[PDB]
Amino acid sequence: GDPIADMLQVLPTAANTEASSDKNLIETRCVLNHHSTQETAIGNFFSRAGLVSIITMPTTGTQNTDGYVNWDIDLMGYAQLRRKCELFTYMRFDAEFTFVVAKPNGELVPQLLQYMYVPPGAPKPTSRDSFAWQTATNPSVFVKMTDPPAQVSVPFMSPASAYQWFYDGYPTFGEHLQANDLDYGQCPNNMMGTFSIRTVGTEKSPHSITLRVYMRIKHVRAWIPRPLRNQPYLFKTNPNYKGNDIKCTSTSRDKITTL
Amino acid sequence: SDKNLIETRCVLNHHSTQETAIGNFFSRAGLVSIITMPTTG
Amino acid sequence: GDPIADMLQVLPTAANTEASSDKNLIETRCVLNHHSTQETAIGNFFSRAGLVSIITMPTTGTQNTDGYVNWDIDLMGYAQLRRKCELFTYMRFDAEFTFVVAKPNGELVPQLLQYMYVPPGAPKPTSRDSFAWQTATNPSVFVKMTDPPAQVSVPFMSPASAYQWFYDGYPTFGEHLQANDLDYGQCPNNMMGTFSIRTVGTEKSPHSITLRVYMRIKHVRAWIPRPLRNQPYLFKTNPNYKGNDIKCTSTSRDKITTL
Ligand SMILES: CCCCCCCCCCCCCCCCCC(=O)O
Ligand SMILES: CCCCCCCCCCCCCCCCCC(=O)O
Ligand SMILES: [Cl-]
Ligand SMILES: [Cl-]
Ligand SMILES: [K+]
Ligand SMILES: [K+]
């Protein structure tokens, strides 16, 4: 008939000890161990809001003095949350963003603000009065600095199945000449666009404004553990480290025989 | 029609069409008026 | 269960004619036609012995004057059998070889002869007395010129499934420089070795000897008909033709309107 023949790892509580791997090298007693493992579930480890951005709109100075700012969404500028995330290679999750806004010294004034999510390809505001603030399709939040911090849920938005903290490659084909090495490690699947903020008015606001953005990871999944960062972070988009001062992971001592 | 002009594999495609329902396309608040009542002018 | 879904043409007698393709364009009668098709069966067409070699061992002259001859078996030197065979691309068959031997004028004398089949790789006789005539493994026939013609059956011996009259290629890899174009069309699967003949004696025979070899194809199979040779043959191993005198396949006449 056929012409060709060739054609869960961690349970809810800690393991008990039975009376005589401890009970393998030493004599043991029985211990009814009911210590929980829930707090080390990745969800509890990650679902804690952490700082991911500090945006300023001063009234004086040489930057963002026009009452609006387009902040390219890049969550790798703060060491604490970054190191936790980088314990894994890939992570998938929804996120809760909270916007804590105040003047530079922490005082609050009755000032109306608008935060708009500008996905990749949507036109960015070019002034406090730009037509883009009409926000007929993009999601916007109007809130006062005297209101409690604004807060919204952002779903998992990557074109890929998970965000990836490490992408060993280039975004496109071509020669990869020295002049473009900045391309290395750049994963467009993590590029979520712009976050735009403005004081709501055609006239300039007399208040300097500082916005602290916190992100809380939720409904998280993680894949492929990796060694934890042991050198200070230098740049947002690469793992460069200071070659002249390579830190040892552990503190030192004089002799291997004395504490 | 791919599987008509080229040889295809089976793809169990579960991509949702909900976000393009006109309700989701339109039910987003947008600016329709700016009214001013200045004290001078 | 499966992760990937994508993974006889001519009868014994001539057709009859039925009373009304003749009976399609003209009115016909019934003809009970019992004309046989047997004589055109390839076996009857081919199983007729034909000349394939004429070997001479003169006593005087400048060739084969030592009472022995090593004849490289190449059956394409005689036009009649060659053209019939070349009607096909591949042919498989056994063969009956008959050896008609006499002096140059047809007279017969009491002379003992030996014919030995020397397959490719067997040592060839280098004299009338060579050790190879011991013929301890090769097949030999000892016969007198006064006996009836010697005759033997040779089986189908090619390493391939059929002999091939046309091989569009080269026997080996390599550059194929102009100096070696003789290689083109050479099929080793048809190369059956050597046919060796000698007068049986350490002393020279006073008789000039002419051997005519006839081959009768039998138990034949043939594949892929091709246009029949329409130019005189020039060489044994290629279809070269005389370019300055290309023969028309049909005779000519003065006008297309008169016979
Ligand atoms: C209406 C106001 C809401 C706007 C909130 C800002 C939304 C920003 C997009 C959220 C993307 C979260 C995934 C981040 C993946 C990390 C990318 C990176 O920094 O390399
Ligand atoms: C004992 C004496 C018997 C020797 C008889 C000669 C045998 C020659 C070998 C027969 C081979 C027949 C196949 C020929 C195929 C055609 C090859 C060619 O000429 O291109
Ligand atoms: Cl507006
Ligand atoms: Cl001998
Ligand atoms: K237990
Ligand atoms: K018939």
**Considering only CA atoms, which residue is closest to atom 8 of ligand 1?**
A73
Question: How many Å apart are CA C59 and CA C69, to the nearest integer?
Answer: 12
Residues A186 and A160: beta-carbon distance below 8 Å: no
Number of A to B CB contacts under 8 A, please give it. Answer: 14
- Return the residue whose CA atom lies nearest to atom 3 of ligand 2: C117
> Does residue A132 contact residue A118 with C-beta atoms inside 8 Å?
yes
CA–CA distance, B20 with B22 (Å, rounded to integer): 6
Maximum distance among all Cα pairs of chain B, rounded to whole angstroms: 73
Give the Cα-Cα-Cα angle A182, A157, A129 (nearest 5 degrees): 80
Closest-CA residue of chain C to B7: C6
Phi-psi label, residue A247: left if phi above 0, alpha if psi -120 to 50, beta otherwise = beta
CA C95 to chain centre: 9
Tell whether the torsion through CA atoms of C115, C120, C126 and C131 is positive or negative: negative
Task: Tell me the shortest Cα–Cα distance from C253 to chain B, in angstroms.
Answer: 55
| Cβ of A150 below 6 Å from ligand 1 | no
Give this entry's resolution in angstroms: 2.5
Tell me the CA–centroid distance for residue A15 and ligand 5, in Å: 4
Residue ranges in chain A assigned as alpha helix (H) = 22-25, 42-46, 79-85
Ligand closest to A236 (CA) is 1
| C-alpha span between C150 and C211 (Å, rounded) | 11
Q: Distance, CA C241 to ligand 2 centroid (Å)? A: 26
Q: How many domains does chain A have?
A: 1
Q: Is residue C26 classed as helix, strand or coil in its secondary structure?
A: coil
Q: What is the CATH number of the domain that holds C209?
A: 2.60.120.20
**Cβ atoms of residues A66 and A27 within 8 Å:** no
- Residue C31's identity, in one-letter code, is V
Atom 15 of ligand 1, residue of closest alpha carbon: A190
Question: From the CA atom positions of chain A, what is the Rg in Å?
Answer: 25
**Contact (Cβ atoms closer than 8 angstroms) between residue C48 and residue C75:** no
Touching pair B, C by Cβ (3+ pairs < 8 Å) = yes
Using CB atoms within 10 A of its CB, is residue A248 exposed (0-12), middle (13-18) or buried (19+)?
A: exposed
Give one word for A104, left, alpha or beta, with left for phi > 0 and alpha for psi -120 to 50.
Answer: alpha
Chains in contact with chain B (at least 3 beta-carbon pairs closer than 8 A): A, C
For A117, residues 6+ apart whose C-beta sits below 8 A from its C-beta are A138, A139, A140, A154, A193, A194, A195, A196
Answer yes or no: are the C-beta atoms of A105 and A160 closer than 8 Å. Answer: no
The amino acid that residue B16 corresponds to is S
Closest ligand 1 atom to A190 CA: 17
Q: Locate all alpha helices (DSSP H) within A26-108, ordered by sequence.
A: 42-46, 79-85
Return the structure tokens found at B40.
């001078």
User: Pick from C216, C229, C211: which is nearest to C87 by CA?
Assistant: C229
- Residues in chain A after which the chain is broken, C→N over 2.5 Å: 7, 20
Integer Cα distance of A74 and A81 in angstroms = 12
Q: Are C121 and C245 in contact (CB under 8 A)?
A: no
Ligand 2 site, CB within 6 A: C 73-76, 95, 97, 115, 117, 139-141, 152, 154, 157, 163, 190, 192, 195
Q: CA torsion, points C42, C45, C48, C53, in degrees to nearest 10?
A: -90
How far, in Å, CA of A60 to CA of A70, rounded? 18
Q: Look at the block and give the residue holding tokens 């056929």.
A: A2
Q: Experimental technique used?
A: X-ray
User: The dihedral of CA A214, A218, A224, A226: what is its sign?
Assistant: positive
Query: Per-residue b/e over A64-77, b at no fewer than 16 CB within 10 Å?
Result: beebbbbbebebbe
Structure tokens at C169: 């290629």
Atom of ligand 1 nearest to the CA of A163: 15
By residue range, what is the domain housing residue C208? 1-259
CA atoms within 13 Å, Cβ hemisphere of C247:
10
Please give, rounded to a whole number of angstroms, the shortest distance from the CA of A95 to a CA of chain B: 19
H/E stretch holding C22 reads: helix C22-25
Q: How far is the C-alpha of A218 from the C-alpha of C75, rounded, in Å?
A: 87
